């Protein structure tokens, strides 16, 4: 499997004075850190969230983000006066890395404005997107004359991020590999027509996210099976609904069959 580390930031400016910035981090499907506007430190949600970092350097990292939050809102405000922009402002950042044993590690750092991409970090500098507006270029060449942030930014993606992901795969080796088995059941929901009934098959409580559910006529794979989204439970497990629109005669004697990585070879089947 793949366990990349994504760090996501949600900065929102409403008017001249009101603004909040919140963040969090993910490793695979699992969320390992939470960072709140009300808080003054990044919170760690797992006993292994610190990786193999010493306490002294986890704190200097805490310090770097602390100054980052203040300066970011200061810099973003000043851009809004400089280039004449209105104040419902929504910035999002999505950075991180992915360690590959085969020596081809990925670095990215993406910024978005009102839900549209505007610029990223590529080699040693920030670069706008083709679709971005023209004012973006005025901001981009003042950002690039901050040699320190550019130099620092380079150290986190190239250097500290791969060390972190490797530390976290060590510490959390047991929770990442865990396996929880789902349970299934059947009800009856929205009926399409008067003669057409809609049979539902719910499966709830599986940890490794990939899953496979499908209705069948015993063992003849039907195509009338249409599954929904994979929705989270508060458990850090998952839930998925599965539907099948058929008439009442073509309804006796079908099955809902589910296959998941945690059930070893056997598969839960539920008939009617």
């Amino acid at each position, epitope marked *: 499997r793949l366990f990349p580390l994504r760090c996501l930031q949600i900065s929102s400016f409403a008017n001249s004075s009101w603004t909040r910035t919140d963040g969090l981090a993910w490793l695979g499907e699992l969320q390992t850190h939470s960072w709140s506007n009300d808080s003054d430190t990044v919170r760690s949600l797992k006993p292994w969230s610190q990786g193999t970092f010493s306490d*002294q350097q986890w704190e*200097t990292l805490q310090h770097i983000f602390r100054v980052y939050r203040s300066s970011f809102t200061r810099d973003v405000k000043e851009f809004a006066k400089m280039l004449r922009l209105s104040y419902p402002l929504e910035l999002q950042v999505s950075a991180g890395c992915e360690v590959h044993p085969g020596n081809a590690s990925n670095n990215f750092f993406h910024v978005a404005f009102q839900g549209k991409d505007i610029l990223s970090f590529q080699g040693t500098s920030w670069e706008p997107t083709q679709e971005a507006p023209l004012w973006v270029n005025l901001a981009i060449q003042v950002l690039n004359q901050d040699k320190w942030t550019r130099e*620092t930014v380079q*150290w986190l993606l*190239n*250097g*500290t991020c*791969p060390q972190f992901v490797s530390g976290l795969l060590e510490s959390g080796k047991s929770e990442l590999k865990k396996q929880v088995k789902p349970k299934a059941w059947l009800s009856r929901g929205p009926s399409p027509g008067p003669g057409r009934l809609l049979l539902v098959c719910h499966v709830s409580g599986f940890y490794p996210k990939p899953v496979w559910v499908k209705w069948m006529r015993g063992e003849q794979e039907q195509q009338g099976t249409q599954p929904g989204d994979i929705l989270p439970n508060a458990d850090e497990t998952w839930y998925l609904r599965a539907t099948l629109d058929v008439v009442a005669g073509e309804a006796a004697g079908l099955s809902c069959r589910v296959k998941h990585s945690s059930l070893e070879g056997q598969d839960i089947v539920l008939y009617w």
Partner: T-cell receptor
Amino acid sequence: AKTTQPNSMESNEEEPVHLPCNHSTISGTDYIHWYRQLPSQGPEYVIHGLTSNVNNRMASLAIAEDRKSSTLILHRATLRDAAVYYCILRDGWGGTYKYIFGTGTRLKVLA
Amino acid sequence: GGITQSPKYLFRKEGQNVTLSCEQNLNHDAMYWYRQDPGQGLRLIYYSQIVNDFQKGDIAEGYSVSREKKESFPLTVTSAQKNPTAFYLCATSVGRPYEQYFGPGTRLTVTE
């Protein structure tokens, strides 16, 4: 968190030179610096890198992929480039500030 | 300018000892005191991350420094040292990627 270099090295003028450095115990957050010092003066920064190869006007840095060794390349050496060359590790966190130099490689440039 | 050690040459006699300069043009928090003998590497006397703050090196024995200000870091040698005659060099550091800069250096021979 130290490095190892040859003690001596000789090279003929108007040619590129390859000066090696070893550091088997390097970490992902350590920079690599090179400094040189001429006989009666004080040293001077030459180049530095972290994870990619680096190119300047006079010299380039070449990192091995396993990061346990590297190389400082002088593109064209003249008599004036005779000096002592120091290979140094620097912690990217900036924790311990015992910034200590090793013993270096002494380059001799023949005519 | 950068760093200015002065003067180039300095002599004195044993017991008639000295304190020595190192003055800083730009603005940097950290300063270092190195020390070199003929054909030998650079050894560290004292380092200082910010004013009112020092840390001893490995040849700090028989020296003493002070940082009242960020623009000055004097070196006194009167503390009886083994070989007070050598080449003294003063350095300075910036933030990440933490590069180092040196002055022109001062040479002091003291007649034994």
